Amino acid sequence: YALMVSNYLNWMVRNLADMEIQLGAVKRIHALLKTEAESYPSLIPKNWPDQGKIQIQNLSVRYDSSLKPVLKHVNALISPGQKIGICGRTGSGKSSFSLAFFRMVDMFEGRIIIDGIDIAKLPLHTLRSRLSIILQDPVLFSGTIRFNLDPEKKCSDSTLWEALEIAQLKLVVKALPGGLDAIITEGGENFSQGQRQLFCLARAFVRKTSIFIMDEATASIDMATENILQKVVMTAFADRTVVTIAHRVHTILSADLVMVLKRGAILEFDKPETLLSQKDSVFASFVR
């Protein structure tokens, strides 16, 4: 035993050095395990109303806890079934406005209300199954077309075919092997940018949330295709009030209620043709 104690000793110290380094991995896994979590039923049994009338009273938002605010004294109201737009330059607060509309920013003050309901007693699973969104960055995760349109796989094949026909995508889907079952990859070169935006619109259609938020569906899209896309999105959305945000002149001109985003606050205007000529085409017309 004393003869071979040495092998044990050096093998043990080698294994201890090999153990601390590998245990650091578990240490940092447990360190990342302790990240903060979002705290995710009287208005729940009542189905969400199609009336898009909403009201935001004295709204302010800050990204980090105790930092510079993003909005300052934001008050607005949106009538049912009325198309609304929001303009402003970069960093004005439109993306932060959409994020505060979906309870994303965790330092918001004021009272946001969507048909008498707020985020004080509703979990996330209920707060997100009520409104749709089409972000500026479209993505098509891997899988089939039935997995890209409806990952929940709750809608029927007729519903998916109808959503593809409304989104001007049924003809290019019928030209794929199998039908609604083509093997798509993450992004790649399987569908064009217009086709990706059309898939996003089809997702919004199958959502059936009755409240749509269009967050810059125009960027990275050719004008010859973006015009037809906006025309199709306007012809398909006659109800289920949509709140758009973009830097295009025609997109902001087509919206009825528009809120010019100032440096720290917002200034709303109900009639588009009224504010597009009341400021003598200085802050609402040439800017848009």
């Binding site: 601390e20 578990v26 990342l32 903060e36 979590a37 965790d106």
Partner: protein, 122 residues
């Protein structure tokens, strides 16, 4: 890194941890026992041979026990830790994802979970 060891062993449970520690200690005790029974053997030779065979069988059984136990504990801790990590990052806010680099959050699942799966048990 003693807190990492504490968190790893606690994710196993008291049952598997106690079984592992008991199996290791008793296996090494049976090892020294057979090596000492050798010395008492040297100088009723049938009785000595029979007890030596019994203790060697006990030793191989105890060693098989301790090996299967350490591997089962490794698998269970891997499963528990991976599930808890995935669920605790699903519940994370968006400001966390904006501030934290995507590379780090992917690397915790890419390399360190592989480490806990393959290298930590052995």
């Amino acid at each position: 890194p003693w807190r990492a060891c504490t968190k790893y062993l606690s994710s196993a449970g008291i049952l598997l941890l106690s079984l592992l520690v008991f199996s290791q200690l008793l296996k090494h005790m049976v090892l020294v026992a057979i090596d000492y029974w050798l010395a008492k053997w040297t100088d009723d030779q049938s009785v000595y041979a029979m007890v030596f065979t019994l203790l060697c069988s006990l030793g191989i059984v105890l060693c098989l026990v301790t090996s299967v136990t350490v591997e089962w504990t490794g698998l269970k801790v891997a499963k528990r830790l991976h599930r808890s990590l995935l669920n605790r990052i699903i519940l994370a806010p968006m400001r966390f994802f904006e501030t934290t680099p995507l590379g780090s959050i992917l690397n915790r699942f890419s390399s360190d979970c592989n480490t806990i799966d393959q290298h930590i048990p052995s």
